[PDB]
Amino acid sequence: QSESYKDAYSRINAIVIEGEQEAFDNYNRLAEMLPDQRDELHKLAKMEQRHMKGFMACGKNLSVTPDMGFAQKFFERLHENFKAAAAEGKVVTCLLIQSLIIECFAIAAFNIYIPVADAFARKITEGVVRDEYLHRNFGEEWLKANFDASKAELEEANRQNLPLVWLMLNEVADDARELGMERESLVEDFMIAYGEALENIGFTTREIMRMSAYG
Ligand SMILES: [Fe+2]
Ligand SMILES: [Fe+2]
Protein backbone atom coordinates (compact mmCIF):
# COMPACT_ATOMS: atom_id res chain seq x y z
CA GLN A 1 0.00 0.00 0.00
CA SER A 2 2.90 2.23 -0.63
CA GLU A 3 3.36 4.81 -3.30
CA SER A 4 5.32 2.72 -5.81
CA TYR A 5 3.57 -0.68 -5.63
CA LYS A 6 0.12 0.75 -6.27
CA ASP A 7 1.42 2.51 -9.38
CA ALA A 8 2.93 -0.74 -10.64
CA TYR A 9 -0.29 -2.44 -9.66
CA SER A 10 -2.36 0.01 -11.70
CA ARG A 11 -0.96 -1.32 -14.99
CA ILE A 12 -0.24 -4.92 -14.12
CA ASN A 13 -3.62 -5.43 -12.65
CA ALA A 14 -5.03 -3.74 -15.75
CA ILE A 15 -3.02 -6.18 -17.80
CA VAL A 16 -4.54 -9.26 -16.06
CA ILE A 17 -8.02 -7.75 -16.32
CA GLU A 18 -7.66 -7.08 -20.06
CA GLY A 19 -6.02 -10.43 -20.67
CA GLU A 20 -8.99 -12.10 -19.02
CA GLN A 21 -11.75 -10.25 -20.89
CA GLU A 22 -9.87 -10.97 -24.01
CA ALA A 23 -9.42 -14.60 -23.15
CA PHE A 24 -13.18 -14.76 -22.58
CA ASP A 25 -13.96 -13.29 -26.02
CA ASN A 26 -11.46 -15.61 -27.71
CA TYR A 27 -13.01 -18.79 -26.35
CA ASN A 28 -16.55 -17.79 -27.39
CA ARG A 29 -15.02 -17.06 -30.85
CA LEU A 30 -13.20 -20.50 -31.02
CA ALA A 31 -16.51 -22.07 -30.04
CA GLU A 32 -17.86 -21.05 -33.43
CA MET A 33 -14.95 -22.31 -35.52
CA LEU A 34 -14.97 -25.66 -33.71
CA PRO A 35 -18.64 -26.48 -33.24
CA ASP A 36 -18.19 -30.19 -32.21
CA GLN A 37 -16.59 -29.05 -28.89
CA ARG A 38 -18.75 -26.03 -28.38
CA ASP A 39 -20.00 -26.11 -24.80
CA GLU A 40 -16.84 -27.24 -23.02
CA LEU A 41 -15.36 -24.22 -24.77
CA HIS A 42 -18.28 -22.13 -23.60
CA LYS A 43 -17.34 -23.29 -20.10
CA LEU A 44 -13.69 -22.29 -20.59
CA ALA A 45 -15.16 -18.97 -21.65
CA LYS A 46 -17.61 -18.45 -18.82
CA MET A 47 -14.86 -19.47 -16.46
CA GLU A 48 -12.54 -16.73 -17.79
CA GLN A 49 -15.08 -14.18 -16.77
CA ARG A 50 -15.14 -15.08 -13.14
CA HIS A 51 -11.32 -14.57 -13.25
CA MET A 52 -11.83 -10.97 -14.51
CA LYS A 53 -14.13 -10.28 -11.49
CA GLY A 54 -11.53 -12.05 -9.32
CA PHE A 55 -8.78 -9.72 -10.34
CA MET A 56 -11.02 -6.64 -10.17
CA ALA A 57 -11.50 -7.49 -6.48
CA CYS A 58 -7.71 -7.55 -5.85
CA GLY A 59 -7.33 -4.04 -7.21
CA LYS A 60 -10.26 -2.75 -5.22
CA ASN A 61 -8.67 -4.50 -2.20
CA LEU A 62 -5.49 -2.42 -2.50
CA SER A 63 -7.59 0.51 -3.47
CA VAL A 64 -6.15 1.06 -6.94
CA THR A 65 -7.58 2.21 -10.26
CA PRO A 66 -6.47 0.04 -13.15
CA ASP A 67 -5.03 1.66 -16.23
CA MET A 68 -7.24 0.00 -18.93
CA GLY A 69 -5.73 2.07 -21.72
CA PHE A 70 -2.29 0.71 -21.06
CA ALA A 71 -3.62 -2.79 -20.86
CA GLN A 72 -5.73 -2.56 -24.01
CA LYS A 73 -2.76 -1.42 -26.07
CA PHE A 74 -0.51 -3.82 -24.19
CA PHE A 75 -2.58 -6.47 -25.91
CA GLU A 76 -3.34 -4.75 -29.26
CA ARG A 77 -0.87 -6.60 -31.41
CA LEU A 78 -1.92 -10.14 -30.34
CA HIS A 79 -5.65 -9.64 -30.24
CA GLU A 80 -5.63 -8.29 -33.73
CA ASN A 81 -3.48 -11.23 -34.84
CA PHE A 82 -6.05 -13.55 -33.26
CA LYS A 83 -8.96 -11.74 -34.78
CA ALA A 84 -7.31 -11.84 -38.22
CA ALA A 85 -7.01 -15.61 -37.88
CA ALA A 86 -10.59 -15.98 -36.58
CA ALA A 87 -11.81 -14.12 -39.65
CA GLU A 88 -10.01 -16.65 -41.84
CA GLY A 89 -11.39 -19.62 -39.91
CA LYS A 90 -7.75 -20.50 -39.11
CA VAL A 91 -8.48 -22.21 -35.82
CA VAL A 92 -4.95 -23.58 -35.35
CA THR A 93 -3.43 -20.13 -34.95
CA CYS A 94 -6.24 -19.09 -32.69
CA LEU A 95 -5.45 -22.04 -30.46
CA LEU A 96 -1.65 -21.44 -30.60
CA ILE A 97 -2.08 -17.78 -29.75
CA GLN A 98 -4.64 -18.16 -26.96
CA SER A 99 -4.40 -21.62 -25.40
CA LEU A 100 -0.64 -22.16 -25.70
CA ILE A 101 1.05 -18.80 -25.74
CA ILE A 102 -1.44 -16.74 -23.76
CA GLU A 103 -2.17 -19.28 -20.98
CA CYS A 104 1.50 -20.35 -20.61
CA PHE A 105 2.24 -16.65 -20.16
CA ALA A 106 -0.47 -16.60 -17.45
CA ILE A 107 0.65 -19.86 -15.76
CA ALA A 108 4.22 -18.65 -15.48
CA ALA A 109 3.29 -15.10 -14.29
CA PHE A 110 0.81 -16.16 -11.60
CA ASN A 111 3.07 -18.90 -10.10
CA ILE A 112 5.62 -16.07 -9.90
CA TYR A 113 2.98 -13.69 -8.44
CA ILE A 114 1.58 -15.97 -5.70
CA PRO A 115 4.61 -16.17 -3.44
CA VAL A 116 4.90 -12.37 -3.44
CA ALA A 117 1.21 -11.38 -3.47
CA ASP A 118 -0.36 -9.54 -0.55
CA ALA A 119 -2.69 -12.04 1.23
CA PHE A 120 -6.12 -11.56 -0.46
CA ALA A 121 -4.46 -11.68 -3.86
CA ARG A 122 -2.58 -14.96 -3.44
CA LYS A 123 -5.88 -16.54 -2.49
CA ILE A 124 -7.65 -15.71 -5.73
CA THR A 125 -4.59 -16.31 -7.96
CA GLU A 126 -4.13 -19.82 -6.55
CA GLY A 127 -7.81 -20.10 -7.40
CA VAL A 128 -7.13 -18.97 -10.98
CA VAL A 129 -3.90 -20.86 -11.71
CA ARG A 130 -5.78 -24.14 -11.20
CA ASP A 131 -8.10 -23.15 -14.01
CA GLU A 132 -5.48 -22.11 -16.58
CA TYR A 133 -3.65 -25.50 -16.37
CA LEU A 134 -6.89 -26.92 -17.80
CA HIS A 135 -7.08 -24.22 -20.52
CA ARG A 136 -3.56 -25.04 -21.59
CA ASN A 137 -4.48 -28.71 -21.57
CA PHE A 138 -7.48 -28.19 -23.87
CA GLY A 139 -5.45 -26.39 -26.49
CA GLU A 140 -2.87 -29.14 -25.96
CA GLU A 141 -5.35 -32.03 -26.44
CA TRP A 142 -6.83 -30.58 -29.58
CA LEU A 143 -3.56 -29.69 -31.26
CA LYS A 144 -1.88 -32.98 -30.41
CA ALA A 145 -4.90 -34.80 -31.84
CA ASN A 146 -4.60 -32.94 -35.12
CA PHE A 147 -0.83 -32.38 -35.11
CA ASP A 148 -0.14 -33.60 -38.64
CA ALA A 149 -2.79 -31.44 -40.35
CA SER A 150 -1.99 -28.53 -38.03
CA LYS A 151 1.82 -28.39 -37.99
CA ALA A 152 2.64 -26.23 -41.04
CA GLU A 153 0.38 -23.44 -39.77
CA LEU A 154 1.52 -23.84 -36.14
CA GLU A 155 5.02 -23.23 -37.33
CA GLU A 156 3.82 -20.05 -39.11
CA ALA A 157 1.60 -18.89 -36.22
CA ASN A 158 4.58 -19.26 -33.90
CA ARG A 159 6.99 -16.94 -35.69
CA GLN A 160 4.22 -14.39 -36.10
CA ASN A 161 3.13 -14.16 -32.48
CA LEU A 162 5.97 -15.45 -30.33
CA PRO A 163 7.97 -12.21 -30.96
CA LEU A 164 5.01 -10.21 -29.64
CA VAL A 165 5.00 -11.90 -26.23
CA TRP A 166 8.61 -11.07 -25.65
CA LEU A 167 7.78 -7.43 -26.22
CA MET A 168 4.95 -7.94 -23.80
CA LEU A 169 7.27 -9.61 -21.37
CA ASN A 170 9.83 -6.88 -21.68
CA GLU A 171 7.25 -4.17 -21.18
CA VAL A 172 6.04 -5.74 -17.95
CA ALA A 173 9.56 -6.13 -16.68
CA ASP A 174 9.79 -2.94 -14.73
CA ASP A 175 6.28 -2.92 -13.14
CA ALA A 176 6.77 -6.59 -12.34
CA ARG A 177 9.94 -5.88 -10.44
CA GLU A 178 8.18 -3.53 -7.99
CA LEU A 179 5.63 -6.26 -7.42
CA GLY A 180 8.59 -8.44 -6.39
CA MET A 181 8.68 -10.44 -9.62
CA GLU A 182 12.22 -11.14 -10.75
CA ARG A 183 12.21 -10.90 -14.53
CA GLU A 184 14.50 -13.86 -15.10
CA SER A 185 11.88 -16.02 -13.44
CA LEU A 186 9.24 -14.73 -15.86
CA VAL A 187 11.48 -15.19 -18.79
CA GLU A 188 12.80 -18.63 -17.75
CA ASP A 189 9.37 -19.90 -16.70
CA PHE A 190 7.45 -18.92 -19.85
CA MET A 191 9.91 -20.55 -22.22
CA ILE A 192 9.95 -23.80 -20.27
CA ALA A 193 6.18 -23.79 -20.05
CA TYR A 194 5.85 -23.11 -23.79
CA GLY A 195 8.63 -25.51 -24.76
CA GLU A 196 7.04 -28.31 -22.75
CA ALA A 197 3.71 -27.37 -24.32
CA LEU A 198 5.22 -27.65 -27.83
CA GLU A 199 6.85 -31.03 -27.14
CA ASN A 200 3.64 -32.45 -25.66
CA ILE A 201 1.80 -31.41 -28.87
CA GLY A 202 4.05 -33.40 -31.21
CA PHE A 203 7.07 -31.20 -31.79
CA THR A 204 10.52 -32.67 -31.46
CA THR A 205 13.18 -31.08 -29.27
CA ARG A 206 15.21 -29.64 -32.16
CA GLU A 207 12.16 -28.14 -33.80
CA ILE A 208 11.13 -26.55 -30.54
CA MET A 209 14.50 -24.93 -30.24
CA ARG A 210 14.11 -23.34 -33.63
CA MET A 211 10.72 -21.91 -32.78
CA SER A 212 11.69 -20.30 -29.49
CA ALA A 213 14.44 -18.54 -31.35
CA TYR A 214 12.20 -15.88 -32.72
CA GLY A 215 12.41 -13.48 -29.77
FE1 LIG B 1 -8.26 -16.79 -17.23
FE1 LIG C 1 -7.45 -18.94 -19.30
Residue numbers in the entry: 13 to 227
Copy out sentences from the published article reporting this entry, exactly as the authors wrote them.
Cyanobacterial aldehyde-deformylating oxygenase (cADO), which catalyzes the conversion of Cn fatty aldehyde to its corresponding Cn-1 alk(a/e)ne, is a key enzyme in that pathway. Cyanobacterial aldehyde-deformylating oxygenase (cADO) belongs to the superfamily of ferritin-like di-iron proteins and contains a di-iron center. To gain insights into the reaction catalyzed by cADO, we determined structures of wild type ADO from Synechococcus elongates PCC7942 (Se) with different treatment (WT0, no treatment; WT1, co-crystallized with iron; WT-HP, soaked in H2O2), and solved the structures of two SeADO mutants (Y122F and F86YF87Y). SeADO belongs to the di-iron protein family, with conserved sequence of two EX28-29EX2H motifs, in which six conservative amino acids from four helices (Glu32 from helix H1, Glu115 from helix H4, Glu60 & His63 from helix H2, and Glu144 & His147 from helix H5) act as metal ligands.
